[PDB]
Design a protein around this ligand. Sequence first.
Ligand SMILES: [Cs+]
Ligand SMILES: [Cs+]
Ligand SMILES: [Cs+]
Ligand SMILES: [Cs+]
Lengths: 86, 386, 86, 86, 36
Amino acid sequence: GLLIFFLFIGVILFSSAVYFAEADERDSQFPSIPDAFWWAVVSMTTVGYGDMVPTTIGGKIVGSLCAIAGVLTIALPVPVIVSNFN
Amino acid sequence: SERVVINISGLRFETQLKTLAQFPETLLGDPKKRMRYFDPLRNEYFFDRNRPSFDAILYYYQSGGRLRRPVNVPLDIFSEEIRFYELGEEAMEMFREDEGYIKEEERPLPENEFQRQVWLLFEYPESSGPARIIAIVSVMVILISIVSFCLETLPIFRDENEDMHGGGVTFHTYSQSTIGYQQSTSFTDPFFIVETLCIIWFSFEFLVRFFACPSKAGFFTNIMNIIDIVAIIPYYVTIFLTESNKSVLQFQNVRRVVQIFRIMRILRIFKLSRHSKGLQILGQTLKASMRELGLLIFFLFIGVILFSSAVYFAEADERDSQFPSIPDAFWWAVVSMTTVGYGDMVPTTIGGKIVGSLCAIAGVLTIALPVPVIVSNFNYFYHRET
Amino acid sequence: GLLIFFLFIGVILFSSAVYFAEADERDSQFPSIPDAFWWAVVSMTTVGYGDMVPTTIGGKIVGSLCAIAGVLTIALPVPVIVSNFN
Amino acid sequence: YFDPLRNEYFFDRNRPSFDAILYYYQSGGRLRRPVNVPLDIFSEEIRFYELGEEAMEMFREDEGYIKEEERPLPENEFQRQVWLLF
Amino acid sequence: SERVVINISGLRFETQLKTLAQFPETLLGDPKKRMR
Ligand SMILES: [Cs+]
Ligand SMILES: [Cs+]
Ligand SMILES: [Cs+]
Ligand SMILES: [Cs+]
């Protein structure tokens, strides 16, 4: 559950920031904050399909932090789960 | 039930004489052997030795066989004690098994004089300067046979043919495609040359090994020898097939097979496992991780089907659905689960994207499970090198 | 070194198989075996750029195994390195 | 087990285990297995000193183990007969 | 082989004098040093 919750907190944060950082664009790939949820989950789990990508310096900065925070978030609850498994 | 007192550097131990008498061939069980350590003034046997070890030695008599090393006692010390108290080899062996160790083999070429002489240059690089040169030369040949096999596909070398622009697919132009090189006792083709020099060497190694072989009994048992054989089977089987089918219409009837054996040449990369410890370690790791490795594929399978199904239905009522059928979505599911996510297939509907999120997360967890074990088995074999 | 070596062994294997499995195609994204090296390293490290992707059932089967073998290969030498670090 | 010459009880048994057996009396119930003593050995001692099943059970719980169930088809003759193939 | 008894806060240790004499410069190996 903590895994889903943390992912949730991250999605909203990064979806919001990316949205605003790409807002003043005629070709913004992020129509709304809820639209950016897909991109955020995709880059956090790092599955990164590339079907939505920031284009502005700001968006790309937000994206970098989203990529890094994603890797750490997942890496936390897993070790335990993995244990219970063994 | 006469009692017996054993004093180990001041630490007092007592037991019954019948307890020690249980093992007549040991030091404490032999009256003539312990006699030397008896102190008639204190009515006890005294040994100026290691204290932590003795609880275990004594328990070995009391338990009737159990010889465990105390958790807090180094293995080098405890084995020295086992020897001193002369518990015997049968017990030390079983002790060493439970402690981890266990193994031993070899045996140079039985007599032979010359057999056992050659079998030291193609089997033991750790013997002489020359024998170590063979390894160097053998590796080169392998790396080369690999680079060769690879260039044979480079269009820069195969687009320089008779029908490069599309105008008359010749027979010896068609068979050179299916093979990668032009076979001919004229040795015109550079590739057919190198590929031939390499098979000569690989054919040499195999024969030499098979003759200077000590136990030709289990030669085709050693997985390493199986590789040496498969590394050359394509070459000769191809010749056989191109000669048995020397006409356009017949070679076309056996082209499939020919192609298969061309693919089988890649297995020559595994010929490096003879000069690579790590490659050998990995092999052992895989043989030891059969169940987890399988569980990994099974779990991935269960996940693929589930997520392929859900994504399919969630993207079904779409004119531009990237998922034609459930089996088509298998690719997407494996791609997103292993998280390699190529993006060549992506959901577009809220539902599909929800399914995709769960597929991404479930993928990360699934993989992360069996790995830890595999990784372990690896470290076990990797470190248990010395 | 073992990390680079194992990656090397994997690249060649999967580059070869993918090549042949996508050979009889007019739109094969794999011109030669050496060309497929890029795809193999890209999918094994799982960075998977999607700039080269198999299209035939066979190619996709090879790709699945390449993705899985990649994840395991990397995961081996790392633990040690990570240790030396700590 | 009494030795009238030395006014003591003598047991030709395992040494590391006894601290625990004795402490069980002193503490009034606590039966812990010494960290350095194998579980197979310690349980044999628990049985020898006849600490009783109520204590062994609680000991085994804290040690990890715990479980047990089943029961074939009650009579049935044929019920309990089929319930062995499915 | 004169024996030597060493008492460490009540824990009893015994060894042979030649065992300690093996290292003459240590406390237990020096008669003048352990005397105390
Ligand atoms: Cs990716
Ligand atoms: Cs991508
Ligand atoms: Cs990872
Ligand atoms: Cs990834």
